[PDB]
């Protein structure tokens, strides 16, 4: 027993991280097969970032201007193309450590692990969630751009995020591995404010089920609710609306614990209305929303 | 910017995990050079765990009774010995993925990453701290025994924990890599209650410095205190006493932020006495104590 914020083992992704330098800008790249993926702003100087014309800046670049280093060895760049906000640098050597992989575009509320890197070297791994406003609350310092987010299904890595930006409010923005930003963000140092960071309701319910499974049951009340009544309270607390699809996805946790989804919703409603009263749930004084229903099942069952 | 509970990249440790089976008991082992380390209770049946005589149980075991599997290949066991609460199984093949490593016995309050495994396969990685009562609050299901805790210093892995037990209260106990339990715990299914889980004061102060560095400054008050005055309040709140060694270790964070250690202590004192008043610090409604001063520096500077 015990429930922890857990990241996927990062080894498979550590074997893909490379350093990419263009001129005086250095960041991280992802080396899969004979292609290195990195944020296109590797071609910008800090001055260019204020209002960059990427196509124009790229005209002044050749294969030999992109310096790719894997460990302490240099990779030969034999091609380069821009796809949305990422550059794909074709190299002459397929990464020998390429794991089975996919590129997926996740939905808000979905969680993933990030392997924070600096100069192509992994520094740490943590678990994130794509917020409903399409930002992520990460930990990224200068040099961390190009670090990726991913999920693992047995031996296949689904890459879902690449780090590009930090908004003026300290939250983070990035793209999927096709270079499309999540949300309305752009790779330009301009006024980009995030929308409401609402709470991922279905994740909070999944985490309340994990708490019950691990012994924390004090918050279970004697009430039930309906989706409509619950959602009126959820709107008031800046919680995402709960749908019948969310109820269906919580079905296995409802079955394992014997607590109906709408009963857990009523417990959540009372926690929102009355507060925690100085108490904790799974060692937290706030309702955790960065565990999906699948993460709860995986951790509570032992998926490897 | 941004501050996250971060684990070390786990690849170096993933390359060491093996499955160890003795009879009908299966758990995880750590394969370093030509030795596989695993909890000695791999020789017990669930019945034996109530009052095991390990020396006696081991007499009925031979090299061929310990089945070690690395991936889908079997390792040949050519020797076996018991060292405290671990078995060391000498194998005929040195692990080709053995990283640079050390075995260290950590002190309470020190943090480390755990790579949770099942049947020798990594499932996830999370950050832990050795509690002042020598337990850890982990996430461990049946089959996770033998999963290890570690820290990384550039390319050297310092292994500090091996999982062995879950106490009746759901908290965890284990040993260093020489087989010595942390705390007074034993590998027997008996009444073992943990002592007071006090808060690691020096870690809370380090995390308050991380909050200041990342913009969360609301809790900074207009007061100072002394170690003696602070410790009187800390005792009342089940916080570990703060020593001059703790003050010295916080020195670099004090220097970077310009906030004297005893000023941060006074801010912490007011947070303990007045509560958070529904506010959060680095997205938490309670004071986080599972970041050491070194972890804060490492994350706030980008150590790889
Ligand atoms: C990523 O490429 C990265 O790793 N750093 C980074 C920055 C960055 O460091 O911003 C500092 C900066 C930039 C522009 C103007 C000033 C005053 C400061 C920015 C964007 C993308 C990345
Ligand atoms: C580790 O070896 C491990 O992975 N599991 C485990 C257990 C365990 O599964 O406990 C279940 C159990 C044990 C004894 C009696 C009953 C009723 C149930 C126990 C100790 C160590 C380990």
Curated annotation (Swiss-Prot), chains A, B:
Q: How is its activity regulated?
A: Inhibited by pyridone-containing alpha-ketoamides compounds 13a and 13b. In turn, alpha-ketoamide 13b (tert-butyl (1-((S)-1-(((S)-4-(benzylamino)-3,4-dioxo-1-((S)-2-oxopyrrolidin-3-yl)butan-2-yl)amino)-3-cyclopropyl-1-oxopropan-2-yl)-2-oxo-1,2-dihydropyridin-3-yl)carbamate) inhibits SARS-CoV-2 replication in human lung cells. Inhibited ex vivo by michael acceptor inhibitor N3. Inhibited ex vivo by compound 11a and 11b.
Show the active-site residues.
Answer: 41, 145
Residues in compartment: Cytoplasmic: 1-304
Every copy of the Peptidase C30 domain together lies at 1-304
Q: Where in the cell is it found?
A: Host cytoplasm; Host Golgi apparatus; Host nucleus
Recorded catalytic reaction(s): these are:
TSAVLQ-|-SGFRK-NH2 and SGVTFQ-|-GKFKK the two peptides corresponding to the two self-cleavage sites of the SARS 3C-like proteinase are the two most reactive peptide substrates. The enzyme exhibits a strong preference for substrates containing Gln at P1 position and Leu at P2 position
Result, substituting residue 90 to R: In strain: Beta/B.1.351
Covalent cross-link Glycyl lysine isopeptide (Lys-Gly) (interchain with G-Cter in ubiquitin), where: 5, 90
> What is the purpose of this protein?
Cleaves the C-terminus of replicase polyprotein at 11 sites. Recognizes substrates containing the core sequence [ILMVF]-Q-|-[SGACN]. Cleaves and inactivates human TRMT1, preventing tRNA guanine(26)-dimethylation of tRNAs. May cleave human NLRP1 in lung epithelial cells, thereby activating the NLRP1 inflammasome pathway. May cleave human GSDMD, triggering alternative GSDME-mediated epithelial cell death upon activation of the NLRP1 inflammasome, which may enhance the release interleukins 1B, 6, 16 and 18. Also able to bind an ADP-ribose-1''-phosphate (ADRP).
Oligomeric state and partners?
3CL-PRO exists as monomer and homodimer. Only the homodimer shows catalytic activity. Interacts with host FBXO22; this interaction promotes the proteasomal degradation of nsp5.
Q: What is this protein called?
A: 3C-like proteinase nsp5
Q: Which organism is it from?
A: Severe acute respiratory syndrome coronavirus 2 (2019-nCoV)
This protein's encoding gene: rep
Query: Fragment boundaries within the full protein?
Result: 3264 to 3567 of 7096
């Amino acid at each position: 027993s015990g429930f922890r914020k857990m990241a996927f083992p990062s080894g498979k992704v550590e074997g893909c991280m490379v350093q990419v330098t263009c001129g005086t800008t250095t960041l991280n790249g992802l080396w899969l097969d004979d292609v290195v993926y990195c944020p296109r702003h590797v071609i910008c100087t800090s001055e260019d970032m204020l209002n960059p014309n990427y196509e124009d800046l790229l005209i002044r670049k050749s294969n030999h201007n992109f310096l790719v280093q894997a460990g302490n060895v240099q990779l030969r760049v034999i091609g380069h193309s821009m796809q949305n906000c990422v550059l794909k640098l074709k190299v002459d050597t397929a990464n020998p450590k390429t794991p089975k992989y996919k590129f997926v575009r996740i939905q808000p509320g979905q969680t993933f692990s990030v392997l924070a890197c600096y100069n192509g070297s992994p520094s740490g791994v943590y678990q994130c969630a794509m917020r409903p406003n399409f930002t992520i609350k990460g930990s990224f310092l200068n040099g961390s751009c190009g670090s990726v987010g991913f999920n693992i299904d047995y031996d296949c890595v689904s890459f879902c995020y690449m780090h590009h930006m930090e908004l003026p409010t300290g939250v983070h923005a990035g793209t999927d591995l096709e270079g499309n930003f999540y949300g309305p963000f752009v790779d330009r140092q301009t006024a980009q404010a995030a929308g409401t960071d609402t709470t991922i309701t279905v994740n909070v319910l999944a985490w309340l089920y994990a708490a019950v499974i691990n012994g924390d049951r004090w918050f279970l009340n004697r009430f039930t609710t309906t989706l409509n009544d619950f959602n009126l309270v959820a709107m008031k607390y800046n919680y995402e609306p709960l749908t019948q699809d969310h109820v269906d996805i919580l079905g296995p946790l409802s079955a394992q614990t014997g607590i109906a989804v709408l009963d857990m919703c009523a417990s959540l409603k009372e926690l929102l209305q009355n507060g925690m009263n100085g108490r904790t749930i799974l060692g937290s004084a706030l309702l955790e929303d960065e565990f999906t229903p699948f993460d709860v099942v995986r951790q509570c069952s032992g998926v490897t």
